[PDB]
UniProtKB/TrEMBL annotation, chain A:
This is 5-histidylcysteine sulfoxide synthase/putative 4-mercaptohistidine N1-methyltranferase. Pathway: Amino-acid biosynthesis; ergothioneine biosynthesis. GO terms for molecular function: formylglycine-generating oxidase activity. It holds the Pfam family DinB_2. SUPFAM superfamilies: C-type lectin-like, S-adenosyl-L-methionine-dependent methyltransferases. Keywords: Iron, Oxidoreductase.
């Protein structure tokens, strides 16, 4: 009962008032646990120590978890009065961004007693909210209870991450507390071995209507197939890692990847971060105690050290050994039939959720099938940088919880440690760290031929690429249907009963019309002057999805993911994208039954030359289709080379009349059509234009 | 005889096929007359003489009136086949801009041009026979283009006869078809006769009978007082006193424009006076004869104006040239009959129905006056201008708009050779003040000071867009934005004081004038001096004119006239240039301050919200609209009100407004308001502004 309340709450309870008391007790117990964590600091002066250079002092996180409640309840408009706006700014945002290179004090921290009194006032506000706020089932993302739970599961994250910081604090500044006792059993390190793990269909990703609270990075759908592989029986113990250290592992550059080698030489690292050099031997550092080395406990390493061990072990065993991917750990868990939190008894079946120890335990204590410590004890590093599943959607109250970590620099860790609580002990939760950062994290190694495919990280934010991604793959504005798609549908319309072997899409941009044309034309080529546009158009064709940000106001953005629909995914093999200047096309681009050029002719420096060159490249009786708003400007075209918008012989020359004039000898005008299109700039500013489509047929 | 066919055709005929034959005869007769004019050139070589340095040689206008038909029939898609595109470009456009192009280069041969005109004649003759005729004739009818080509040629019949009259006497040949008047005597003494004032109302309705150019349509009303006009036109003999008194030698009589022209041409005598020993001889179209002292004199405006200034000094009275309204008043007072009421012979020396020259000023009487119409054109002091309701014809959109430059003064009455549309009362012709025509002048005595507005059309891209934004049409069905915002301001101020209001970022002031309908005093402020000038111009003059882009350099001529309900509240409005971030302290004590689409265009919007609060009365309303397009082009990121993250949470713009306006204002409501800004005929900005309505704390 003392630590069982730290398990994540099942939210689909039969009674709403029974769920109220569970959330009330889940909040106070989490608040109590975090405040009890700092009782391991010797005195109030130790709150202002910075144990990890890449993080704040303890005092910041002491108030940060309470301030986080107020800032989210104010932003969600659940409450309207702040408790202390001064403190709520100073404890606002933590620090990531640690390239292992640095804040220099210059912070005026409140006193420890000041922060204690503030935290107590946050507790009554939330307690009053839990008492007075209506509870409507089921709990949705819009429900105010989601924000309260967000503060709870965020505080539980800081329970673990501050315990690492305490474990990194000078031993003279910490005080052992019986509420945070260590494991007292340790012995000989067992001999690890590689055991068989079967492959199969991996299917992870949380649906929107699943039961527990979850962060945004948990939701989506991800499927892949991994082969049969081998995983180590135990986590890598201190003793197993001791062989690597005694074989000059930190001295031999052959084992260290280029990033880890750079980190190792900067830190001048010679041994794991919680190994204390003692004469010719090594001692071990728990949260608040220095004890003799427990050789059968797991080792604590960042990614670089664990990877260096795997490269060293590969040379000894003569076999390719590496860290697992996230999918391989999920396969291992399912193969071992690890039970979810909802099926646990009075005690957790792993060293987890603070239900057994406030430190690691022997790697031989908790078994799961043929394996040990599949969950619990310490985190297990992976080689998969955290990434959003297909269907990922941010929560509006914390839109940047995970999206800044989608940078191919935060490697996923699985299993959870002895102190991982709440959301962290769910199977669907996904936590990641910079590959140099230290936690209660070790590693299990695998032997696998599986080569995981990593995609481009982050979201594209170049304003020009963002707009045209939205223009071809975004939503409809003012009820105007998709312009690249509508144009392509008209191309398919006016070519019924006509040849459809080859088609060319000049000015294809992000290639929506190109893929739409490929549904009826056997070979379609997309050309655009922008190498950036072609890169995104090819990425959508290969990967089947693109990610980008569109502006709402100023620097604020919305995160968008455009996924290729099933009907367009079939025809990706009929599409090619190339960078090309429409006024000097390579001779290889010829023999087309249809050439489409959308919003292009009024953007070319010599549109007459393009019309003269593209005619020689269309088959007899082929179709040339042009759309343009006729925005003639000296920015793109010299006035002498405009097709319209000027007076000659005292009569106005309209652009459509100039098009007949340049296409008189070789083309015939079928029809003209007016087509609206909308290009989004911000959430409130758009371009709304009426382009003219002109449909031409080649003279036989 | 057959000269009646040159009268303008009444288009509301009983039968459509009777109008066809009238137009058929009107075309051939006009085509015949223009070609008969150049028989007064002695040989083909004279076609390449340039009599007037500000115009082309005769050969150009010889083929121009035929090329005009083809170019208009091609542009209006009435025909699709050109006769000679090479010549249709050489004879395409004449030249104006003749302030005191195509030099001495190779023109087509005279025989080449003859054969071309003949092929043009059968194309038009074919069209007149085969085109369907639907009554009534409209601007969209193909018969309007044919009438346009006919009436354009009649203009060149008169203007080319001037050029012939300016041609060296050795290169012209008198023709019996163009005989002069042979009667002349002593000049009578002119006198000023009474002309009554009253209500002047001119302007052609769209559904009126005759063919007319664009500058004839619209409505113009004014009131002029009683005045006096000279009984006769100024004769050579009357003008001779001015010339013998050193008129061309005395600078006191010449206005600045005319003095500069006279020194440039070294003018010592009228243009058609030939100095012979100590006397002067006279030049008709093709003959040099003794001075007909009782014929009217041929002068430009500068010479006519200098005569009036000289006569003002002699008589001790303010004598000037009439304004166009005054000539129309003299015409109505003398009961001059319209062309539709004429008998077999015109009641004036006009329409080539009497002479190919001027005649004595004592010949044609109209009431107590002579030559109210006919004989020679009569100069005015009115630069030509479009009436309210002026609309161009798409086939010839620049026929008159380039003359709306305050430099082309109107001339009225017509001359002996004015034909067709020129002899209608509603027709309006104008020339640059230095230009020479068969034009004389009557003088007047009047204290009436005519008001002249700003000429031309505004073409600066920004001023055009915001003129269209405040005073143009609706696009995508979106209601006028400055007007809608002002109406909402009135809405949310019901039961509140309405003494003084301020419109910051007023642009062309549509919202400012709209606010004046319920606010006793409205002040409009804007950073752009160009905008404030146009806003004040709309307030004083009641109308503004600007061009909006269709494609490239092509434009659309727009006229925004102040509506009747806003003209009443004009006296309550002030327009001043001002920087909203550093306002002068005199702008204060407002019951409403409205700022449309401004805060995200200011360098320091927070400072503006702090300054403007001090200047609103207790319980007054502050209303802001903005799309929140925050950009470092206008505002440093540090001074944004929204669109940024702080303390790890997003700050939306409306929440930043509440934060800055917390101490002094209360948010009443917010509304989304769409607006459209036109860039071209096909490109627009379509945005959704948020209107935030704030009320100041009572204490
Ligand atoms: N991206 C942040 C999310 C976070 C905020 N607080 C705790 N965790 C991180 O990895 O640390
Ligand atoms: N604005 C021109 C109109 C015109 C063309 N041709 C004859 N007239 C002019 O006054 O001369
Ligand atoms: Co945090
Ligand atoms: Co002309």
């Amino acid at each position: 009962f003392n630590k069982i309340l730290l398990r994540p709450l099942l939210l689909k309870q039969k009674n709403p008032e029974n769920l109220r008391q569970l959330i009330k007790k889940s909040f106070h117990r989490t608040f109590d646990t975090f405040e009890s964590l700092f009782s391991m600091l010797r005195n109030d002066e130790a709150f202002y120590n910075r144990p990890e250079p890449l993080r704040h002092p303890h005092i910041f996180y002491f108030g940060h978890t309470a301030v986080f409640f107020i800032n989210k309840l104010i932003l969600s408009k659940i409450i309207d009065t702040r408790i202390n706006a001064k403190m709520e700014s100073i404890f606002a945002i933590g620090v990531d961004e640690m390239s292992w290179d640095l804040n220099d004090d210059h912070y005026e921290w409140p006193s420890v007693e000041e922060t204690r009194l503030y935290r107590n006032r946050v507790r009554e506000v939330v307690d009053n909210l839990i008492n007075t706020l209506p509870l409507e089932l089921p709990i949705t993302w819009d429900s105010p209870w989601w924000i309260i739970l967000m503060g709870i599961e965020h505080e539980r994250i800081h329970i673990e991450t501050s315990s690492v910081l305490i474990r990194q604090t000078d031993i003279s500044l910490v005080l052992p507390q019986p509420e945070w006792s260590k494991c007292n059993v340790s012995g000989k390190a067992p001999e690890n071995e590689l055991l068989f793990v079967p492959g199969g269909e991996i299917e992870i990703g949380k649906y929107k209507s699943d039961d527990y609270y979850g962060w945004d990075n948990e939701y989506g759908k991800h499927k892949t197939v991994i082969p049969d592989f081998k995983a180590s029986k135990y986590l890598v113990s201190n003793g197993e890692f001791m062989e690597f250290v005694k074989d000059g592992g930190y001295e031999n550059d052959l084992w260290w990847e280029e990033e880890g080698l750079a980190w190792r030489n900067f830190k001048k690292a010679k041994h794991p971060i919680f190994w204390i050099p003692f004469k010719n031997e090594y001692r071990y550092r728990t949260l608040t105690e220095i004890v003799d080395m427990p050789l059968d406990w797991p080792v604590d390493v960042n990614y670089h050290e664990a990877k260096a061990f795997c490269n060293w072990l590969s040379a000894k065993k003569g076999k390719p050994i590496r860290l697992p991917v996230e999918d391989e750990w999920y396969r291992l868990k399912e193969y071992c039939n690890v039970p979810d939190v909802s099926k646990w008894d009075e005690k957790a079946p792993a060293n987890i959720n603070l239900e057994h120890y406030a430190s690691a335990c022997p790697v031989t204590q908790f078994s799961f099938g043929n394996f040990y410590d599949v969950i619990g004890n310490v985190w297990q590093w992976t080689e998969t940088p955290i990434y959003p599943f297909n269907g990922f959607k941010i929560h509006p109250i914390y839109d940047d919880f995970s999206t800044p970590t989608f940078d191919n620099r935060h490697n996923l860790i699985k299993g959870g440690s002895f102190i991982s609580t709440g959301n962290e002990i769910l199977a669907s939760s996904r936590y990641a760290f910079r590959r140099h950062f230290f936690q209660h994290a070790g590693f299990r190694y695998v032997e696998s031929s599986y080569k995981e495919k990593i995609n481009s990280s982050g979201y594209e934010s170049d304003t020009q690429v963002s707009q045209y991604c939205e223009f071809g793959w975004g939503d409809r504005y003012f009820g105007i249907e998709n312009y690249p798609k509508r144009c392509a549908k008209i191309c398919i319309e006016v070519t019924e009963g006509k040849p459809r072997k080859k088609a060319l899409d000049v000015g294809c941009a992000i290639g929506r019309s190109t893929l739409e044309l490929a549904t009826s034309f056997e070979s379609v080529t997309g050309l655009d002057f922008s190498a950036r546009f072609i890169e995104m158009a090819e990425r959508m064709r290969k990967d089947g999805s693109i990610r980008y940000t569109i502006t709402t106001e100023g620097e604020l953005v919305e995160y968008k993911e455009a996924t290729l629909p099933k009907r367009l995914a079939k025809v990706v093999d009929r599409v090619e994208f190339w960078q090309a200047d429409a006024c000097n096309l390579k001779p290889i681009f010829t023999g087309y039954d249809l050439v489409f050029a959308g919003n292009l002719i009024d953007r070319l420096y010599d549109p007459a030359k393009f019309l003269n060159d593209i005619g020689k490249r269309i088959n007899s009786g082929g179709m040339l289709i042009l759309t343009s708003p006729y925005t003639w400007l000296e920015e793109f075209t010299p006035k002498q080379k405009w097709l319209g918008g000027f007076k000659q012989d005292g009569e106005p020359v309209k652009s459509i009349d100039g098009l007949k004039s340049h296409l008189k000898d070789s083309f015939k005008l079928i029809e003209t059509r007016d087509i609206e299109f909308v290009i989004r700039e911000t959430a409130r500013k758009f371009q709304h234009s009426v382009a003219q489509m002109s449909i031409w047929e080649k003279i036989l």
